[PDB]
Curated annotation (Swiss-Prot), chains A, B:
Keywords: Detoxification, Electron transport, Iron, Metal-binding, Oxidoreductase, Transport. Fe cation 1 binds at C9, C12, C28, C29. The keyword Plastid does not apply. Catalysis occurs at center II. Fe(2+) ion of center II is the electron donor and is converted to the Fe(3+) form during the reaction. The protein sequence in PubMed:10617593 comes from protein overexpressed and processed in E.coli. It catalyses: reduced [rubredoxin] + superoxide + 2 H(+) = oxidized [rubredoxin] + H2O2. This is Desulfoferrodoxin. Catalyzes the one-electron reduction of superoxide anion radical to hydrogen peroxide at a nonheme ferrous iron center. Plays a fundamental role in case of oxidative stress via its superoxide detoxification activity. It comes from Desulfarculus baarsii (strain ATCC 33931 / DSM 2075 / LMG 7858 / VKM B-1802 / 2st14). The gene is dfx. Belongs to the desulfoferrodoxin family.
Amino acid sequence: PERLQVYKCEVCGNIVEVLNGGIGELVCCNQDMKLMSENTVDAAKAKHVPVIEKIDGGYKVKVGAVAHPMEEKHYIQWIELLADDKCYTQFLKPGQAPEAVFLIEAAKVVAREYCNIHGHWKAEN
Amino acid sequence: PERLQVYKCEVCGNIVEVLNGGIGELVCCNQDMKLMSENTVDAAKAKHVPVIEKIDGGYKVKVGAVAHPMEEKHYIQWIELLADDKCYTQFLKPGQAPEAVFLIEAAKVVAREYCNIHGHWKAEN
Ligand SMILES: [Ca+2]
Ligand SMILES: [Fe+3]
Ligand SMILES: [Fe+3]
Ligand SMILES: [Fe+3]
Ligand SMILES: [Fe+3]
């Protein structure tokens, strides 16, 4: 595994983020955890691809161009802002608007989001 | 596993952080992954317990009361700041200072740091 990759156990629901890579394969509930590669699920990009907006002191991230649902059974679980050496994670809950604000000093950033139903997506500024 | 918990795979090196909890046991290289519980390792607190300093617009975290080594074989791999529903992670490498700055609007925070040799540690304000 590699740093910052996201893996999920399709059985119990465990989802983890790699902090240190290693050489072992991640396993859970008798099967290899699935690498959740960004922008791979056959879903609408309009509501899943993060939209990044530069603001004073940081960035505002919206999911997505069109507001994604935030219902109990279908919502954005978290939005992250990545830099060359930072990963800021903002968890969300149903009922909230699919957006997050990150105060950070980085010219180049990558925003990611995870939809409980449609998976992992990313975009860069 | 519960959100924010850090697990390590003995022998193979992988270290992951839980983004979504579940009942399944994380496995890697033929053993259950080891929960890296904070402040349980028999090591000097002076160099491992994070020190939190409130600054303008955020917090400055130093590891620790006494500067921790940042050598190729013994260093702080990352520092995190936890608040409400946020987990901000700053990755570090040998040769850098055992310090991290986080711009966040939260009165109550928890700082964490992971030493490649002495494990997981935390502190709160
Ligand atoms: Ca994080
Ligand atoms: Fe392993
Ligand atoms: Fe969706
Ligand atoms: Fe599982
Ligand atoms: Fe140490």
